[PDB]
């Protein structure tokens, strides 16, 4: 009974799905596990809608394909840390609010995240969130190759600090898959 | 294969006037005469992708040295690596024995332009006018006020572009039966 939504309190800041965020070095199988995870449930995840300053293109549709934003309204939204991460390139300048982010369970659909390490530690810096965090792993360091392999290392390293709720090592494609549902739907 | 015997044809106008909308009808109307050029990159296949079709994939060492041979029309970096479209590419829908669009802006116009060897077609589908564009953008349920007005000057500055001659066809988009219609003749002229 804290902080009930009324005609007297229109807020809507309560308990909502949690977003998932995942993480893991390319190579790993991590895009086949999410195409077949997508391919299966079609209806249940949702990716955030990024925001970004440059012009529309043809066929973009605001609120779909990006948030498009003015530069200064960007730049408050820096200073006021509503992004989980933002670039700029070309004078333009592009982002991921934690906003889009609970845009995206609105629809009660689950937001799934897959973003990098850096990625992972801002989530964590935002208590807004209350995201859940999945690492896929290779079998090895080793397994990994056929130089930008010690990127791979330190996700690696990262992981073994216990930062995600859940390691799913892929030696196995079917049984990484099972786990990643049984995760998923837990 | 065949050499470089159809023109390619770069078709441009302000976001919003229904340019996606004649070109996805043109597709599926005509399924066979048709491509889009295909981006190269550095960046390593994702398992399920094929080289040739969604990405010709390269190494850093010869995209760079495809930098240095002149081969792109436009390269830039995205995150870790290289992206660009060749003038290759474009050839290679020709090769195929179809036709290349270029489904691009005013800024992509002249930067073809500017490669006169792809010997481009330009066509720039245009809104009957700035005011009539605001109206069709406000009709849809999506547009805030900033994502329009961007369109609108955008579109202001392509229609003072139109306006110098630079196109080799003008279709002004205010009914889409007639727009189509004229797309047509003028792709298969």
């Known amino acids: ?3 009930i939504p009324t005609t007297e309190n229109l807020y809507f800041q309560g308990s909502m799905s ?3 965020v995942i993480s893991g070095p390319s190579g790993t199988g991590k895009s086949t596990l999410l195409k077949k995870l997508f391919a299966e449930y079609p209806d249940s995840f949702g990716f955030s809608v990024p925001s970004t300053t440059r012009t529309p293109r ?13 530069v200064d ?4 939204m820096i200073k006021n840390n509503e992004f989980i991460e933002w670039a700029q390139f070309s004078g333009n300048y592009y982002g991921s ?3 889009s982010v609970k845009q995206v369970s609105k629809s009660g659909k689950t937001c799934i995240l897959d973003i990098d390490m850096q990625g992972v530690k801002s989530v964590k810096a935002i208590p807004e969130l209350n ?9 090895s360091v080793e397994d990994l190759k056929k130089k930008r392999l010690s990127a791979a290392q330190a996700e690696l390293a990262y992981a073994e600090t216990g930062a995600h709720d ?7 494609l ?7 549902k049984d995760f998923i739907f837990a």
């Open 166 to 172: 859940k390691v799913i090592v892929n030696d196995d």
């Open 131 to 139: 995201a859940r965090f999945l690492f896929i792993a290779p079998p």
């Open 1 to 3: 009974d804290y902080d």
């Open 73 to 76: 309204e960007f730049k408050s």
């Open 97 to 99: 609010t934690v906003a």
């Open 18 to 20: 949690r977003p998932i």
């Open 58 to 70: 043809a066929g973009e549709v605001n609120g779909k394909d990006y948030n498009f934003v003015s």
């Open 174 to 180: 079917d049984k990484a898959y099972k786990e990643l």
